[PDB]
Amino acid sequence: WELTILHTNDVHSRLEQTSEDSSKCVDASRCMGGVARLFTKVQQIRRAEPNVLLLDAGDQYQGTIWFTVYKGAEVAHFMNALRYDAMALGNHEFDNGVEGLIEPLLKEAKFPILSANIKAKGPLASQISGLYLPYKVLPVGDEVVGIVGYTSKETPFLSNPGTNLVFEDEITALQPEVDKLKTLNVNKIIALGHSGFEMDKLIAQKVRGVDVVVGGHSNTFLYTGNPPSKEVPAGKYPFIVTSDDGRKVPVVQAYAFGKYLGYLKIEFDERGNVISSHGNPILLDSSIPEDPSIKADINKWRIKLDDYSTQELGKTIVYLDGSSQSCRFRECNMGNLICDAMINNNLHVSMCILNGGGIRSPIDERNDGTITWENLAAVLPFGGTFDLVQLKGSTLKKAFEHSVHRYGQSTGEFLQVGGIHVVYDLSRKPGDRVVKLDVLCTKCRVPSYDPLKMDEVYKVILPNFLANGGDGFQMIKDELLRHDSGDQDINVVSTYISKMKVIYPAVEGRIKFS
Amino acid sequence: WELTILHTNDVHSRLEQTSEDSSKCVDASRCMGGVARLFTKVQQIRRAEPNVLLLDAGDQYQGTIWFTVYKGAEVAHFMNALRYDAMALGNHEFDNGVEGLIEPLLKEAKFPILSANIKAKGPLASQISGLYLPYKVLPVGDEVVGIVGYTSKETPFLSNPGTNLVFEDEITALQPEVDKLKTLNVNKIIALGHSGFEMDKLIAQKVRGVDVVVGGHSNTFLYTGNPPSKEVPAGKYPFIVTSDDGRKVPVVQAYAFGKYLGYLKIEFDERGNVISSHGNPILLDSSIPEDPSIKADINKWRIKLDDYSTQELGKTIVYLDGSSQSCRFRECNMGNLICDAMINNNLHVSMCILNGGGIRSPIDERNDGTITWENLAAVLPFGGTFDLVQLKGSTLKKAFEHSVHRYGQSTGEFLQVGGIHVVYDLSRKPGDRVVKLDVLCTKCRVPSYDPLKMDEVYKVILPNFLANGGDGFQMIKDELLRHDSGDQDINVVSTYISKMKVIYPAVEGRIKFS
């Protein structure tokens, strides 16, 4: 018995087709993804194969002006039009609190929404009961397939789930659910969740009875053969994990932003044992036509959003590189721009720090340089604030050591800077990688760069996320000796662009490698 | 017979008292120089000593809004009110052409104006004849003192004297004039001129019959004992030169901007032999009251100039360091500001170069940060343009080698930069001091810094002065493969400040030393 798993993850409000970098579609002929193109490819596989499952591994919420305006009603609507079979809860599903998950998605979806490790407590327990499930048994032709859900335990440190939700360890919470399915004679079991590739592999290893792991969160790209685009594979597709009980468990993910549609074909026997598995993510490029019916509906919903592109806030003559392969690895000019908007809005305060992972999209300069509220909404979607903090030289030094402590894994904590010249030597031990740290003086008439002093105290502009110890920056949370709340992150960057009129941020050497 | 020489040089339109850096007087209680304070000290010496000469060694023209508006009529007026005895022609006396020297100064001055090495030719010869003199014999009590003038041969490469004026070698032109004075039994001879301290010393050495050299042009500060201000002495006051014929010849200069009044007391015998000489420049600080009559007249002339301070073009929250001790020696933030105003006005063009000597004044931030047309007029008084040029990598490399070829002598050619990261190793041979030269790419979507290539061609924004080979930049003149004239230098910097509203240029590491 053959099963075709079609899967998406970390779509992040990219309901419309995008450029290859996942920012707004400028050159339509080379545009990718979007739900209309996705609907065409799904329909094609559904005609060709009898046993198909369309699954989402979370983080449909947050990313573009679609979520800013419709707040998830678009997620429920277009995921229903595409006829998704199940969806696991992601951390961005809690960005608008539990209320913002319950009303526009949980109550509106025509498919089960899953998470076995999210437990409700207090006054919320009665309210959210039944709206999401730990598992769902789905009929697939003449057979039955069990789907178990999970969500990152990191969700309270990344989102706004509130005080009445407990995030248990995935493996601990999944084993009694899979055991329960085995007792009901459900011999075909999919773990569908949002915890990242490292967790996906451990679930595949330790959770007895799991046949396949369909994951997300870490935007992992997997491929067998020669990849079709810019994305570099982190492993073969599917990634094989040998479970503690000796089974070959396929582990899958399909990058992010709806650029690819994951496609895994599984061969099961009568007892639900995985005989074989093969496939690859399918690049949703312009070679696949967008569905005309879906595009017509997308275009109807577009009318309300056209108000966030009406006004040209300013222009860029440079590509604004806000991509994760740049901003989580090195100095990126989008990071320089935002840190310059931060320092300018507060002018003394000479220094700025900014987690690269907080930068959610690039902006393309080819559309006559035009920067709109919509272009900016994709770069900064969280609605955070840029705060003023006072830090010891030693604290700021520990933050920069933390910035590169696990360098190479595309992690969010890598800092973008303003009024700071940092030099890292990656060849050294984590916690001893900063080889130079020069800072811009405030207590001077002519601002110039001087070596940071451990026994000195500096005023840093940073997002509230970092001021509250986000991205594992516990030293900032624990050691800050002053914290003032500032202006809204999007309004800070918008006013600066308006004042500058024409912008051209460069990669200047604020961050260097030895 | 005792003679007191009171001398000024390179006053540069600083008719009003200034701050200690020579920019506009903000804090009146610690303000210096100006003609009113100078008049008080001169009057004091004139009461104390019977044989006094008040001399000017040139460059009264150019420097502040006083010259911009009155075009030299203020020079003639206040130099007459101070009762100057003689003045040697400087190169800035030719900034407004020969017409701009003849009409507001030559025809209006109540004292001889001298230069023995400036020779008139063509249609101008008949026009300028007698308006300036090669020498002047002046009665000083019961004795007679001969004063010979000279001007820098560099004047045609620094100013606008035109095609009908020949600048001969000073020593060649001075010897027949001094010889002529010796035949008329003038045994006391002063050489008063504008060629710089190195030339002043050679005239003292080689021109037989010269008793004293009163110079200018190089803003040389000389002192005996402990100096009273920021100015570092380049030698003792007077500087003694032993002439080829064995005489001890005192050589004097009194810095610039009317901050100091040079004071040299000479002891002559009956045959005009210099027995002894002593003195020092007198710091014209607030301890010397300004003359009330002169200040009243200065205040009358001020009314017309108050129109150039009426409008606040923008604000600075940083001291704008446009001083020669910074801009001719290292990266200065005034240079960064002007190079940023240049790149911004032309936006691809990523690179800017700017001779430090072209920056004529700092701007102080303490007057509520206020930048006016008057503040800017002192920084950029020449009315030049910022031009676009196309240069080979090899040409730009030779220009940067030329920038530091004679480093240490406060020379004008030291370049301020935009979109360029240069590293100099001064320990190396002149012409091989550039150890790193990184440039900002134009042919890229994300501008970043890359090592300059000799076989590449770049678009540089620079003042017309450098495009025409000024400051010995013959390689730019001879090798530029494109030259387009740009916008007026003051209007470029003014528009940028207006657009930015609040400015804070830093010393960023654009220029470094190894």
Ligand SMILES: C[C@H](Nc1cc(Cl)nc2c1cnn2[C@@H]1O[C@H](COP(=O)(O)CP(=O)(O)O)[C@@H](O)[C@H]1O)c1ccc(F)cc1
């Ligand atoms: C509480 C949260 N605050 C944030 C602010 C900022 Cl400035 N950055 C953030 C977060 C959260 N994550 N991040 C970065 O995103 C990275 C993770 O991104 P990914 O690897 O792509 C995997 P996900 O798609 O689940 O974020 C972190 O490492 C962080 O660098 C927030 C608040 C309000 C909202 F409406 C939405 C979210």
Ligand SMILES: C[C@H](Nc1cc(Cl)nc2c1cnn2[C@@H]1O[C@H](COP(=O)(O)CP(=O)(O)O)[C@@H](O)[C@H]1O)c1ccc(F)cc1
């Ligand atoms: C033809 C001249 N162009 C100039 C433009 C610029 Cl951008 N800079 C310049 C000059 C001349 N000199 N300089 C710098 O001044 C330095 C010399 O200054 P000082 O040592 O102080 C001794 P002086 O007071 O006689 O200038 C030179 O080395 C140069 O760096 C010009 C044109 C129009 C005018 F209304 C006035 C002058």
Ligand SMILES: [Ca+2]
């Ligand atoms: Ca099974």
Ligand SMILES: [Ca+2]
């Ligand atoms: Ca003599």
Ligand SMILES: [Zn+2]
């Ligand atoms: Zn995600």
Ligand SMILES: [Zn+2]
């Ligand atoms: Zn996630």
Ligand SMILES: [Zn+2]
């Ligand atoms: Zn001068």
Ligand SMILES: [Zn+2]
């Ligand atoms: Zn001069």
